[PDB]
Amino acid sequence: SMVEVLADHPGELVRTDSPNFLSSVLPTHWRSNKTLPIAFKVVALGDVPDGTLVTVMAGNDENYSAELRNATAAMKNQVARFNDLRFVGRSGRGKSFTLTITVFTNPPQVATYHRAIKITVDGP
């Protein structure tokens, strides 16, 4: 249940654009190819079997799909923890990326992370 899920992770999860998923918090601006400060997690509020895969993609109007590293994780106890997601492709200082989340239930569901992320060679 959402109340129970919030209660396992108080103060750590944010809405996605889908009522069925929450996520951990990403930086607003990060350095290309740098390890993230908070390992990314996608949390299912609904039933998602263990082993269900989750993949993320990043892009914008200039770049349909920016390079990522380690952009797939598997659900376990309704949480998919990405061990080492990295943002490699750069948005530049003037634009940011939207991060789309795909959860490979049958059939797959798509969610979007709740903020844009800027990726530059130097970072913030």
For the chain, helix (H) and strand (E) counts, in that order, are: 1, 13
Q: Is 118 in the site for Cl ion (CB under 5 A)?
A: no
Q: Is 90 in the site for Cl ion (CB under 5 A)?
A: yes
The CB-of-122 to Cl ion minimum distance in angstroms stands at 7
Q: Is 121 annotated as a binding residue?
A: yes
The binder of Cl ion chosen from 66, 75, 80, 103 (CB under 5 A): 66
Q: Is 67 annotated as a binding residue?
A: yes
Q: Is 67 in the site for Cl ion (CB under 5 A)?
A: yes
Which residue is closest to Cl ion by CB?
Answer: 89
How far is Cα 80 from Cα 93, in angstroms, rounded to an integer?
A: 30
Q: Determine if the peptide bond prior to 107 is cis (ω within 30°).
A: yes
Q: Is 92 in the site for Cl ion (CB under 5 A)?
A: yes
Phi, psi (degrees; rounded to nearest 5) at 99? -110, 115
* Of 20-28, 72-80, 85-93, 99-107: span binding Cl ion (CB under 5 A): 85-93
How far is Cα 68 from Cα 40, in angstroms, rounded to an integer?
A: 13
Q: Is 60 in the site for Cl ion (CB under 5 A)?
A: no
Residues in contact with Cl ion by CB under 5 A are 66-67, 89-90, 92, 120-121
Known binding positions: 63, 67, 90, 121
